[PDB]
């Protein structure tokens, strides 16, 4: 009866979110959340009371994140678009994802990803470099966290550096054990924050299952991708 109105507001909040109307979407989230609290503090049942916590805390996470980004426009950002990668979704190859935001003006790429250690992660980074050379990229700056098992990482990136150097592309790799924020930056203004980073792929089914070489057909983990501009 009263909680039914809370459903309509949150629905509009989601619509505005997808339509990239973030300032309006945020306000609707706050009202949708507030209405759920007036229901949560009213419900006596214990099973339903735990259902609302999930619903509220899920919405609250989204709302709080939007506010962070809108405050983050201090020269660093401009919440342009967010694309959700659903659990076990497809069509999210590194080419398909950065297709639009890549052009001839891009000559320098910054990447902060704390998870470029294991073998598959190295290849993920490798394919990321591959599509970055066809466009006009000169220098690539990588910042990843330090493993210690680090030989595969320290030598792996070293070989990729040498191979990129064979195409006249200079790779600069730096390590830091105290990083967490995933961040992609192009010198044209575009910036991309992926939840998992370059590791949103799950291992394939069989040795010759579809989506082993072309990651457009490869299923993905559930993650979020946020797009920004700097002008």
């Amino acid at each position: 009866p009263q909680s039914t109105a809370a459903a309509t507001v949150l629905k509009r909040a989601v619509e505005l979110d997808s339509e990239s109307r973030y300032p309006q979407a945020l306000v609707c989230y706050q009202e949708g959340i507030d209405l759920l609290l007036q229901v949560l503090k009213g419900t006596k049942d214990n099973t339903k009371r735990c259902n609302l916590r999930e619903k509220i805390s899920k919405y609250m996470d989204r709302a709080e994140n939007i506010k962070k980004y809108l405050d983050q426009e201090k020269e660093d950002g401009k919440y342009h678009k967010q694309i959700k990668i659903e659990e076990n979704a497809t069509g999210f190859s590194y080419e398909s994802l950065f297709r639009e935001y890549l052009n001839e003006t891009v000559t320098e790429v910054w990447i902060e990803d704390p998870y470029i250690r294991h073998t598959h992660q190295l290849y993920n980074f490798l394919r990321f470099c591959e599509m970055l050379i066809k466009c006009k990229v000169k220098t690539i700056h990588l910042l990843t966290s330090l493993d210690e098992e680090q030989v595969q990482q320290s030598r792996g990136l070293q070989e990729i550096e040498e191979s990129l150097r064979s195409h006249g592309v200079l790779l600069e790799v730096q390590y830091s054990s105290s990083i967490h924020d995933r961040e992609i930056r192009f010198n044209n203004g575009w910036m991309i924050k992926i939840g998992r980073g370059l590791d949103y792929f799950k291992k394939p089914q069989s040795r010759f299952s579809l989506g082993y070489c072309d990651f457009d057909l490869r299923p993905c983990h559930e993650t979020t991708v946020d797009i920004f501009h700097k002008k």
């Binding site: 959340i33 507030d34 609290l37 949560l40 503090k41 805390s57 609250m60 709080e64 506010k67």
Partner: peptide, 14 residues
């Protein structure tokens, strides 16, 4: 729960 969530709503309208 009603104390954890209601406080987060204050951070939004802050």
């Amino acid at each position: 729960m009603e104390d954890q969530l209601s406080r987060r709503l204050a951070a939004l309208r802050n």
